[PDB]
């Protein structure tokens, strides 16, 4: 409720759209990526920027819910991974 109150009290009358509460005050971001071409654009490296914030990856899993390391996300190693890759990141500060 810290960032939640920060954005609620910053509203005109304490009312905000729902689509921005996870976009502003969520401590964890989950990114579902269908292929490596979208992975390199969005979740490049151990930290990436999205939704006007900085996110640092803490865990990447595949559709099998198996922890896959960042070194495994390669052009040549892409067909060896189940591909809806689900990268989970934490908010940076």
């Amino acid at each position: 409720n810290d960032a939640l109150n920060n954005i609620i009290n910053n509203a005109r009358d304490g009312c905000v759209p729902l689509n921005i509460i996870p976009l502003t005050t969520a401590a964890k971001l989950m990114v579902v990526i269908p292929d490596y071409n979208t992975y390199k654009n969005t979740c490049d490296g151990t930290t990436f920027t999205y939704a006007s914030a900085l996110w640092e990856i803490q865990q990447v899993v595949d559709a099998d819910s198996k922890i896959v390391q960042l070194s495994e996300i390669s052009m040549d190693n892409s067909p060896n991974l189940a591909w809806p890759l689900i990268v989970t990141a934490l908010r940076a500060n």
């Binding site: 609620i8 009312c15 729902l18 921005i20 990526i33 939704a51």
Partner: protein
């Protein structure tokens, strides 16, 4: 010959190339919007009093600039010259050149419009509204002459389709800036007419694609400063093009210029009421109907539809993060809660709940159910979701891992199959072979099918045409009766069905129809009459036998939405599914001769009968939000007494927030539904039925209007077309006499058999051949310009 060319090249642009045969006219097949006391409509005619000379650039290079010189009578010549001199100072007016040129033995007057495009605005509007892939050459020329695409783009098959090759949206969007400039020039022209005291009716055929205006032969002059530009037909016919070309895409920029970064709106900002009014004043300054940016302030359902049509166009500018539930922090037992105390619809504007408690002691059952059905708490308690598999706006991930639901293969029936092959079945070459199977689906199938909502585009409907189609559809839904029913009068079949999200965690609909007394359900239903309850719709993979490998998905609507929609609609729905011999055949059994009765009622009185069925591609996924709102309003037309105007509007808002733009729970995470039919709601079949009737009526209206009224031999049909144009773009209130007349005409010549998007029409073949009734091509064009799909004639 050569002297006439030089006379046309008066003082500028001497480099003109004759498109005709010298001093003779250039006959073209253009689209006009005529309404002159005999013939009315919006059809393609043959212009035979027009000499076209196309300007050429340096080094003899043809350019999109024509000197359309026309010869007319002396009175019209001088009248047009005077009104142009009154309007020549306006920048948004084609440079007119007036002179008398001797042709054979007399000085025939001529009017030379300068720097005109080959096709007018009406040509583009007709091409986009009466589309036909068999012959669409004006559209191709417009697309290639304005760098929308190349001629090589049309060599690709299904270049025009929306489901196949969605890049046609990007191709049409390149016409968006040109259409927006045409809108701005139209506003400037209206201002000039008002200030100069010129009274006339604006039509798309009098504006070229640059935006400049011409044809003043029907304008009349009055006292300056009191002029009135009659622009209803122009804007109304342009409305489908505005969203198809995304004309207001430049409004999402810092200075409304397509060279600046997208304007970074405040994330907390959701109202945009002032921005909508500014957009309306900028593009529809002289639209002579009050526009309510928030539909809570609308007068009736017709005004709701009218203002929602503008809101559809205006919401394409504002960020998608500013729509959906409007939430605020409330306190229960002194503990803060995040609940939706309002909603920001892309079509209904900003809606605020009336019974909002910022503080409370405790919530017993009703508020608990509302806040559980509310996506506010789940979205606020979930992890931010960036799902790149789909273009739909993701909201949050409720669980820490994405749930991948698969579809199992069918369970074989080896005994029955062996018995069948024992009886000589499934022989090599038999006319009967297994084509229907339980097609299996992989993990990323539910989200893949949910991404088909990308075919749901913000569609601005022809509002002056839609407001008449609504009246005709209401006449179709006249024999039925409906209204509010109490919780004790609600019939629920299969109480052991799932109850949306998150109510499926604790039990089926039986629990929530047993845990809630009749007074509890009545209180919840009356709450929706003055509040908005956004709900979470769970997307469920269908496990059924089909002939298509594509995954089938049904929408699991929450028990909070379904229970209230039952109390709001079930009376009308049961009346519809209790009536025999009606257009909608829901509830009519095919057994015991019921199929024969249905077909005989279809063949009611058609003089030259043919049977015609069509297909809506991605019907539940591509249905415009305007048409879904129209369906809900037509179903709400029965609440003249049980509901106030505020109650009806808030029920419509609940419909839109629950089954039109709700939070979908595909997989294990929330998403934003762009629109279309959430085909799991309490009115799925009946809403699809009214949508189908609306599409059929729109196709019939377009067939009547896009018909040469001079060539309509029947004097009754010609007058019907004239009065149809009058009731669409001239008459502002409902003409119940002509609504009944057109409804009777449709029943006599276009009798329908309507179920949920499945239809059979017994239509007068000799009328559809003459364009007096939609044959199949009017349906294809209507789907193209009002459903954002290409109706393949191989599915019809």
């Amino acid at each position: 010959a050569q002297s006439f060319l030089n006379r046309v090249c008066g003082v500028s642009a001497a480099r003109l190339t004759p498109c005709g045969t010298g001093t003779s006219t250039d006959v073209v097949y253009r689209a006009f919007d005529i309404y002159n006391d005999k013939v009315a409509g919006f059809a393609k005619f043959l212009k035979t009093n027009c000499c076209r000379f196309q300007e050429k650039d340096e080094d003899d290079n043809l350019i999109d600039s024509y000197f359309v010189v026309k010869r007319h009578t002396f009175s019209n010549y001088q009248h047009e010259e005077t009104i142009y001199n009154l309007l020549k100072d306006c920048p948004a007016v084609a440079k007119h050149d007036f002179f008398k040129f001797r042709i054979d033995g007399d000085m025939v007057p001529h009017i030379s419009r300068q720097r005109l495009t080959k096709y007018t605005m009406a040509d583009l509007v007709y091409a986009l509204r009466h589309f036909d892939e068999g012959n669409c050459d004006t559209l191709k020329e417009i697309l290639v002459t304005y760098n929308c695409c190349d001629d090589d783009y049309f060599n690709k098959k299904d270049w025009y389709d929306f489901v196949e090759n969605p890049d046609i949206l990007r191709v049409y969007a390149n016409l968006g800036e040109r259409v927006r400039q045409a809108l701005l020039k139209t506003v400037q022209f209206c201002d000039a007419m008002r200030n100069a005291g010129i009274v006339g009716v604006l039509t798309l055929d009098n504006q070229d694609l640059n935006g400049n205006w011409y044809d003043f032969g029907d304008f009349i002059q009055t006292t300056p400063g009191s002029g009135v530009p009659v622009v209803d037909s122009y804007y109304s016919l342009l409305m489908p093009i505005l969203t198809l070309t995304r004309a207001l895409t430049a409004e999402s920029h810092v200075d409304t210029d397509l060279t600046k970064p997208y304007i970074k709106w405040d994330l907390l900002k959701y109202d945009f009421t002032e921005e909508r009014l500014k957009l309306f004043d900028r593009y529809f300054k002289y639209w002579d109907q009050t526009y309510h940016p928030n539909c809570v302030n609308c007068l009736d359902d017709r005004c709701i539809l009218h203002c929602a049509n503008f809101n559809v166009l205006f919401s394409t500018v504002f960020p998608p993060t500013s729509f959906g539930p409007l939430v605020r922090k409330i306190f229960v037992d002194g503990v803060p809660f995040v609940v939706s105390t309002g909603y920001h619809f892309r079509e209904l504007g900003v809606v605020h709940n009336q019974d909002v408690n910022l503080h409370s002691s405790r919530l017993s059952f009703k508020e608990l159910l509302v806040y559980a059905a509310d996506p506010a708490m789940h979205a606020a308690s979930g992890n931010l979701l960036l799902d790149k598999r789909t273009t739909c706006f993701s909201v949050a991930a409720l669980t820490n891992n994405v749930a991948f639901q698969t579809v199992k293969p069918g369970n074989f029936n080896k005994d029955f199959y062996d018995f069948a092959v024992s009886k000589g079945f499934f022989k090599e070459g038999s006319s009967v072979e297994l084509k229907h199977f339980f097609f299996a689906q992989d993990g990323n199938a539910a989200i893949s099918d949910y991404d088909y909502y990308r075919y749901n585009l913000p569609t601005m409907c022809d509002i002056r045409q839609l407001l008449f189609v609504v009246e005709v559809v209401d006449k179709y839904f006249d024999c039925y009766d409906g209204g509010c029913i109490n919780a004790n009068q609600v019939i629920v079949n299969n109480l052991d069905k799932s109850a949306g999200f998150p109510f499926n965690k604790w039990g089926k609909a039986r629990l929530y129809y047993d845990s809630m007394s009749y007074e509890d359900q009545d209180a919840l239903f009356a709450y929706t009459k003055r509040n908005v309850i956004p709900t979470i719709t769970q997307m469920n993979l269908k496990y059924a036998i089909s002939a298509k490998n594509r995954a089938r998905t049904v929408a699991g609507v929450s028990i909070c939405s379904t229970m209230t929609n039952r109390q709001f609609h079930q009376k009308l729905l049961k009346s519809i599914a209790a009536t025999r011999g009606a257009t909608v055949v829901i509830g009519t059994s095919k057994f015991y001769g019921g199929w024969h009765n249905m077909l005989k009622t279809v063949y009611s009185d058609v003089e030259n009968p043919h049977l015609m069925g069509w297909d809506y591609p991605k019907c539940d996924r591509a249905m415009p939000n305007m048409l879904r709102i129209m369906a809900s309003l037509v179903l709400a037309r029965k609440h003249t007494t049980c509901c106030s105007l505020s109650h009806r509007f808030y029920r419509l808002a609940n419909e839109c927030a629950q089954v039109l733009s709700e939070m979908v729970m595909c997989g294990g995470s929330l998403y934003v539904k762009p629109g279309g039919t959430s085909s799991g709601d309490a009115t799925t079949a009946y809403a699809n039925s009214v949508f189908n009737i609306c599409q059929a009526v729109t196709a019939n209206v377009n067939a009547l209007l896009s018909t040469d009224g001079n060539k309509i031999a029947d004097k009754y049909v010609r007058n019907l077309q004239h009065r149809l144009y009058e009731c669409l773009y001239r008459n502002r209130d409902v003409d119940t006499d002509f609504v009944n007349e057109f409804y009777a005409y449709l029943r006599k010549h276009f009798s329908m058999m309507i179920l949920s998007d499945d239809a059979v029409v017994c239509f007068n073949s000799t009328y559809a051949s003459q364009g007096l009734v939609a044959s199949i091509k009017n349906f294809k064009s209507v789907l193209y310009y009002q459903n954002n799909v290409f109706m393949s004639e191989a599915k019809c």
